[PDB]
Design a protein around this ligand. Structure first.
Ligand SMILES: O=C(N[C@@H](Cc1ccccc1)[C@H](O)CNCc1cccc(C(F)(F)F)c1)c1cc(N2CCCC2=O)c(=O)n(C2CCCC2)c1
Length: 370
């Protein structure tokens, strides 16, 4: 049913992926960044030098003021504004119209990005993390309640400027090859999962697995990098350095401070290691792994790249670095996230991104922090 949604996503580099939407009556058109790591629907609603277009409440006859402000701070950027509801559609989405909560963004800081082509943000996670609180129903919850759209969506982010698909209401077999493998959502707030082992070039990092999920581990289409807790990050960087020691790089590279260059075509991919995350599976003592290549974690901007693994103090964030290799299925109805090899992933002639299992892992519940 879903060819109509294929290729409904666009963007630039590490400036997020966006889908076209309409708000209000008559329909105003905006591009909205798709964000599995938050839960507020919000839109530019006033002049800003990075916005070429914005939402104008005056001239929608279906607007309703809710007379309540709201504030949202992210790992990067923050904004405040004014709540209301309005009628909203997704043109290359399902043929439906819904009445959703919408934040009209009045002030903001280091949120909007110059030349980005998007004007708001569609928070696809659960109510538990909506500002101002619980009770502001997120967009997808309204969609599901107000229509007959099944309670799942799936994302295929291609890292080629950049493109992909958001299939709302199901799964499209043309976007992946191999099998889908599934991990439980641990709790409905973020799309929280449990990582149970980490390998770099087939070698185990040998930490207490609690450290991998310290605070929490989440899947987040609105974050660029693979972000890793302090302890895990360093250990990761040590192993990555050693396997690539055949050449040396500035300390500022490993910190994302720098950038690193080679003769167009000549990038020494092979000297760089494969990274595997093992995730909790669906059956007793059962896990599977996702493997990424350096083409995913060295992101391009002589051909030059930035190291897109970085430190975090709020847990693991599996952003675009992770997602670009896979088709990712957010199966809210069964509380699980599926991974499969994406049909648009960047091939090495020697190696591939992979989703593999089953494997056996004991005490998987114990890997989650409390
Ligand atoms: O924090 C970021 N993403 C937000 C959403 C967002 C989109 C566009 C601009 C700014 C922010 C995600 O929502 C983060 N989810 C985790 C989260 C942390 C804190 C609070 C919340 C919540 F729920 F309250 F919103 C959620 C973030 C974080 C980024 N960073 C900073 C260090 C490495 C990295 O990937 C980043 O590069 N981006 C890029 C800018 C455009 C999108 C990719 C974004």
């Amino acid at each position: 049913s879903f060819v109509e949604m294929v290729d409904n996503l666009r963007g630039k580099s590490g400036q997020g992926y966006y889908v076209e939407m309409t708000v209000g009556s008559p329909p105003q058109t905006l591009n909205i960044l798709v964000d599995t790591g938050s839960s507020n629907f919000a839109v530019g609603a006033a002049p800003h030098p990075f916005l070429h277009r914005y939402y104008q409440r005056q001239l929608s006859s279906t607007y309703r003021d809710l007379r309540k402000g709201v504030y949202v701070p992210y790992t990067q950027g923050k904004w405040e504004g004014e709540l209301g509801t309005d009628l909203v559609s997704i043109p290359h989405g399902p043929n439906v119209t819904v009445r959703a909560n919408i934040a009209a963004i009045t002030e903001s800081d280091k949120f909007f990005i110059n030349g980005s082509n998007w004007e708001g943000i569609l928070g696809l996670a659960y109510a538990e993390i909506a500002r101002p609180d619980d009770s502001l129903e997120p967009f997808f919850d309204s969609l599901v309640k107000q229509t007959h759209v099944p309670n799942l969506f799936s994302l295929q982010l291609c890292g080629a400027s950049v493109g992909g698909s958001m299939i709302i209401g199901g799964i499209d077999h043309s976007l992946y090859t191999g099998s889908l493998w599934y991990t439980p959502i641990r709790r409905e707030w973020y799309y929280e999962v449990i990582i149970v082992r980490v390998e770099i070039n087939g070698q185990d990092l040998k930490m207490d697995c609690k450290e991998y999920n310290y605070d929490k581990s989440i899947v987040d289409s609105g974050t660029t990098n693979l972000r890793l807790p302090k302890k895990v990050f360093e250990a990761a960087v040590k192993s990555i350095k050693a396997a690539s020691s055949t050449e040396k790089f500035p300390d500022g590279f490993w910190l994302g401070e720098q950038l690193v260059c080679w003769q167009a075509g000549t990038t020494p991919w092979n000297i760089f290691p494969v990274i595997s995350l093992y995730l909790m599976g669906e059956v007793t003592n059962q896990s599977f792994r996702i493997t990424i290549l350096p083409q995913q974690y060295l992101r391009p901007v002589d051909d030059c790249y930035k190291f897109a693994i970085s430190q975090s103090s709020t847990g693991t964030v599996m952003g675009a670095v992770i997602m670009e290799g896979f088709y990712v299925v957010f199966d809210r109805a069964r509380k699980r996230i599926g991974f499969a090899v994406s049909a648009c992933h960047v091939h090495d002639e020697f190696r591939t991104a992979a989703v593999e299992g089953p494997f056996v892992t004991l005490d998987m519940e114990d890997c989650g922090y409390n």
